[PDB]
Write an enzyme that holds these catalytic residues in place. Structure first.
Site, PDB file in Angstrom:
ATOM      1  N   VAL A  26       0.888  -1.122   0.060  1.00  0.00           N
ATOM      2  CA  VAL A  26       0.005   0.124  -0.059  1.00  0.00           C
ATOM      3  C   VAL A  26       0.864   1.387  -0.106  1.00  0.00           C
ATOM      4  O   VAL A  26       0.541   2.398  -0.886  1.00  0.00           O
ATOM      5  CB  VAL A  26      -1.050   0.004   1.262  1.00  0.00           C
ATOM      6  CG1 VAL A  26      -1.662   1.335   1.384  1.00  0.00           C
ATOM      7  CG2 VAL A  26      -1.869  -1.126   1.039  1.00  0.00           C
ATOM      8  N   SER A  28       4.564   3.380   2.359  1.00  0.00           N
ATOM      9  CA  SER A  28       5.362   3.211   3.513  1.00  0.00           C
ATOM     10  C   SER A  28       5.311   4.499   4.333  1.00  0.00           C
ATOM     11  O   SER A  28       4.363   5.413   4.235  1.00  0.00           O
ATOM     12  CB  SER A  28       6.947   3.066   2.657  1.00  0.00           C
ATOM     13  OG  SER A  28       6.900   1.747   2.476  1.00  0.00           O
ATOM     14  N   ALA A  30       8.540   6.326   7.569  1.00  0.00           N
ATOM     15  CA  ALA A  30       9.782   6.133   8.421  1.00  0.00           C
ATOM     16  C   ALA A  30       9.577   5.242   9.333  1.00  0.00           C
ATOM     17  O   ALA A  30      10.583   4.566   9.689  1.00  0.00           O
ATOM     18  CB  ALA A  30      10.305   7.498   8.880  1.00  0.00           C
ATOM     19  N   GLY A  32       7.481   2.345   9.110  1.00  0.00           N
ATOM     20  CA  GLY A  32       6.888   1.010   8.709  1.00  0.00           C
ATOM     21  C   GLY A  32       6.447   0.999   7.358  1.00  0.00           C
ATOM     22  O   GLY A  32       6.478   2.012   6.512  1.00  0.00           O
ATOM     23  N   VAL A  34       3.466  -1.003   4.945  1.00  0.00           N
ATOM     24  CA  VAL A  34       2.138  -1.814   4.704  1.00  0.00           C
ATOM     25  C   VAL A  34       1.787  -2.488   3.481  1.00  0.00           C
ATOM     26  O   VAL A  34       1.968  -1.733   2.657  1.00  0.00           O
ATOM     27  CB  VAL A  34       1.073  -0.628   5.341  1.00  0.00           C
ATOM     28  CG1 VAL A  34      -0.260  -1.522   5.451  1.00  0.00           C
ATOM     29  CG2 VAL A  34       1.422   0.058   6.481  1.00  0.00           C
ATOM     30  N   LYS A  49       1.332  -4.413   8.930  1.00  0.00           N
ATOM     31  CA  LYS A  49       2.461  -3.412   8.864  1.00  0.00           C
ATOM     32  C   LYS A  49       3.798  -4.202   9.322  1.00  0.00           C
ATOM     33  O   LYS A  49       3.554  -4.778  10.607  1.00  0.00           O
ATOM     34  CB  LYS A  49       2.047  -2.176   9.740  1.00  0.00           C
ATOM     35  CG  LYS A  49       3.080  -1.316   9.975  1.00  0.00           C
ATOM     36  CD  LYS A  49       2.303  -0.491  11.165  1.00  0.00           C
ATOM     37  CE  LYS A  49       2.813   1.209  11.122  1.00  0.00           C
ATOM     38  NZ  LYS A  49       2.154   1.840  11.916  1.00  0.00           N
ATOM     39  N   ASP A 164      -2.985   5.642  14.019  1.00  0.00           N
ATOM     40  CA  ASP A 164      -1.816   6.243  14.846  1.00  0.00           C
ATOM     41  C   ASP A 164      -0.966   6.887  13.939  1.00  0.00           C
ATOM     42  O   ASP A 164      -0.692   8.220  14.082  1.00  0.00           O
ATOM     43  CB  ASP A 164      -1.052   5.090  15.792  1.00  0.00           C
ATOM     44  CG  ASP A 164      -0.901   3.726  14.818  1.00  0.00           C
ATOM     45  OD1 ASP A 164      -0.016   3.069  15.527  1.00  0.00           O
ATOM     46  OD2 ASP A 164      -0.927   3.587  13.618  1.00  0.00           O
TER      47      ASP A 164
END
Ligand SMILES: CC(C)n1c(Nc2ccccc2F)nc2cnc(Oc3c(F)cccc3F)nc21
Length: 337
Positions: A26, A28, A30, A32, A34, A49, A164
């Site tokens: 999907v 990115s 810094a 992670g 996904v 993730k 988050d």
């Protein structure tokens, strides 16, 4: 232990249980990367993730621990929570990767400016869901602090969950009291951001597109007007007091002007969210009781959160301590039914 397979996706190895199939990047950040995937257990699509370098440093390690703790706690319809958490590691000693799994929504609010515009009913529904989620988060003494459209995950049914971290400016949606320093603020910093988001949904324009932190304050005061004595007296920082005052003087604008066309109940709610003084801004719970949401508000179905222990935030620990703590939380995870 289930069987894990490996796959290279844009320069990194993903190692996941066979249960998760058809991994599709999907995007990115810094913190992670996904992938969308298909969960063979449920026949539902999920977001997976892979944390980027979780124990690179004490700051990575503490962020990894914070993310896992937070996601394990969140159990609400309008907040992203955890379907699964896994690692290909079979012991603490080989533990260097963490993967987190949630429901896949499909898009974010910012990639809903594709729509061209929303009816008032859609604005009511989307902002209602954000506020319902914030009530819950705020009740756990959690402050988001970076709410913006890319942090709001929305499916094709217009159901919304607070993330988050999203994919992809923070300052456009940030409250004025935390623009220069973190001395005097509370959870209503997130309400400011909701006001900013709401404005943009009604208008199709970003409300306060500042070029930097001082231009941001300038645009903000042009709308809400320069503060009077009662607010200036609460600002400690001589630097901050001086930027605010050194503009010239500006009248609070008529929100009925800048948002003409809008449901006057929307306009009234906006004026309550976009209050300069942190101490006087409406809370999430107060906002849910406003007449703008009369079609959606039900006090019997706007839950609060179980108590959340954030005492770890005060702690300065070793990377191996954060890492062991994180591992315990992985081992102790119980998936929802
Ligand atoms: C892409 C990322 C921001 N993301 C996460 N992250 C994540 C956070 C914590 C634990 C596990 C996770 F995978 N979960 C998502 C659920 N749904 C969507 O939907 C989309 C979309 F599919 C494309 C673009 C924007 C989105 F929000 N994005 C999610």
């Amino acid at each position: 232990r289930p069987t894990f397979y490996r796959q290279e996706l844009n320069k990194t190895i993903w190692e996941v249980p066979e249960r998760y199939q058809n991994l599709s990047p999907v995007g990115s950040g810094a913190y992670g990367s996904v992938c969308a995937a298909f969960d063979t257990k449920t026949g539902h699509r999920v977001a997976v993730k892979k944390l980027s370098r979780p124990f690179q440093s004490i700051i990575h390690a503490k962020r990894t621990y914070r993310e896992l703790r937070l996601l394990k706690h969140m159990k609400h319809e309008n907040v992203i929570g955890l379907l699964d958490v896994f690692t290909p590691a079979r012991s603490l000693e080989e533990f260097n990767d963490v993967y987190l799994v949630t429901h896949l929504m499909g898009a974010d609010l910012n990639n809903i400016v594709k729509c061209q515009k929303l009816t008032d009913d859609h604005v009511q529904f989307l902002i209602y869901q954000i506020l319902r989620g914030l009530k819950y988060i705020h009740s756990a003494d959690i402050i988001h602090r970076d709410l913006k459209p890319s942090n709001l995950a929305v499916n094709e049914d217009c159901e919304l969950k607070i993330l988050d971290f999203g994919l992809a400016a923070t300052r456009w949606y940030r409250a004025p009291e935390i623009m220069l320093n973190w001395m005097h603020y509370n959870q209503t910093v997130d309400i400011w951001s909701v006001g900013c988001i709401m404005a943009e949904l009604l208008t199709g324009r970003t409300l306060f597109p500042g070029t930097d932190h001082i231009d941001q304050l300038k645009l903000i005061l042009r709308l809400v007007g320069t503060p009077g004595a009662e607010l200036l007296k609460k600002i400690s920082s001589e630097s901050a007091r001086n930027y605010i005052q050194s503009l010239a003087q500006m009248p609070k604008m008529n929100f009925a002007n800048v948002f003409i066309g809008a449901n006057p109940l929307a306009v009234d709610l906006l004026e309550k969210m976009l209050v300069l003084d942190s101490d006087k801004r409406i809370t999430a719970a107060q906002a849910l009781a406003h007449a703008y949401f009369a079609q959606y508000h039900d006090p019997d179905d706007e839950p609060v959160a179980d108590p959340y222990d954030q005492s770890f935030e005060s702690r300065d620990l070793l990377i191996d301590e954060w890492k062991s703590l994180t591992y315990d939380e992985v081992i102790s995870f119980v998936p929802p039914p």
